[PDB]
């Protein structure tokens, strides 16, 4: 059991492992191995200042 202030950070950036699409391409491949909803529009919030 560990205290909440000592909850460790799990970085994606490997160090001498990944940085660019080295982490992304490794994940896209591991994924391949396994009534549309109405959405908010641009400028919809602006309109509420009239």
């Amino acid at each position: 059991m560990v205290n909440i202030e000592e909850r460790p950070i799990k970085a994606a950036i490997g160090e001498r492992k990944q940085t660019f699409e080295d982490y992304l391409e490794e994940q896209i491949q591991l994924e391949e191995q396994e009534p549309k909803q109405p959405f908010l529009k641009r400028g919809e919030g602006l309109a509420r200042f009239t």
Partner: protein
Amino acid sequence: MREIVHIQAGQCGNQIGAKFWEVISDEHGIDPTGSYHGDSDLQLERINVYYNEATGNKYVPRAILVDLEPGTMDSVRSGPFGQIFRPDNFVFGQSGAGNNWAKGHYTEGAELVDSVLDVVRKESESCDCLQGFQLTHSLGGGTGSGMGTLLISKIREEYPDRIMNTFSVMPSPKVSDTVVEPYNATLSVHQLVENTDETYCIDNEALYDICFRTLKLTTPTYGDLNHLVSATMSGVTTCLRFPGQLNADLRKLAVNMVPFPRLHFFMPGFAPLTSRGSQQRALTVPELTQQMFDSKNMMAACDPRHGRYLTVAAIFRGRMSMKEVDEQMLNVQNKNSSYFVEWIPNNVKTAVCDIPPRGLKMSATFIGNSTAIQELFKRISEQFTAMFRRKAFLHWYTGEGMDEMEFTEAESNMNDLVSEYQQYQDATAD
């Protein structure tokens, strides 16, 4: 303008929200049982903003604790100040959001949303004068991001004339290894652009760099990042919690800080930067001013010299010379006038609170509306296009009934936002 309703969603929102309540409870003299045991009537003058008065001279956070995951509720309740929260204000489900924005916004989060709104309504109708809402959440996961923005959206319909304020934690590959975090962040930024009045950009990249580079913590923890967050939240809310003339309410702060409705994303900063277990040797007023305006002291990973300030809010805490504070605030604007917009006269406002934060005799907190915040959105946008151009992991969102055209609206809105910040960065008053 009295009461603020605080909502905390997801793991990050509840972890930074719990830290906020520990810090301000200490400042206001409230102990972990809810009892007041302070020594100054200034601690109680504006206690009503964040706390409800209960029987037994108890003060209860007007906080609503939300998560689809019950384990976060267990964590908060067990924490140092876990007992100050109202038990009926812990709204949780028996599922998660699986670090997927669509699960929190459309499916799982939507099933729990009306239970949260019942609690929000109970707190709201019980206010003599509701200022508005304050939400703590991360933009990288499912609950704080998806359900937090759904809560923002539903609250705005019901309370359209109340300020919507957020503390939004930006994702960073330096801190988390979830590939889809740029998706959840872009989808949330689109929501924030339209539905919030003021959003503080708490960037995990900046928090990781402050811990590693300046504070010299070679292996930083979430507690280390949250120490900078709680210090920021304490400083940026000082004006709302203590007596004063300037930015003393959410509306007055927004009317001073937000010139254009979409440009409400603030870059917070503070001085001195401290670590969890080190006792600070007080800073002079020139030291306080120099450092709070320094890039190394900002909570969003943006170089303020790569932009211009539209508006600035500066808060000085502790017993210090006000003559020195006005000398230093005038000097910082004169020496670096090219970094402040000329077409917004007197855009830098300074406040002074006599009560300094815990452990310090003197401190300063900065809130800037800088056009350099486009560096943060550009960074998220680059990570988003890398995945979206390949349609990577899209089936996770699309499978929850989400329209693929929403990714396009969100990407277009965040790229429009970047472009608007650049338009005002180039704007001249000729």
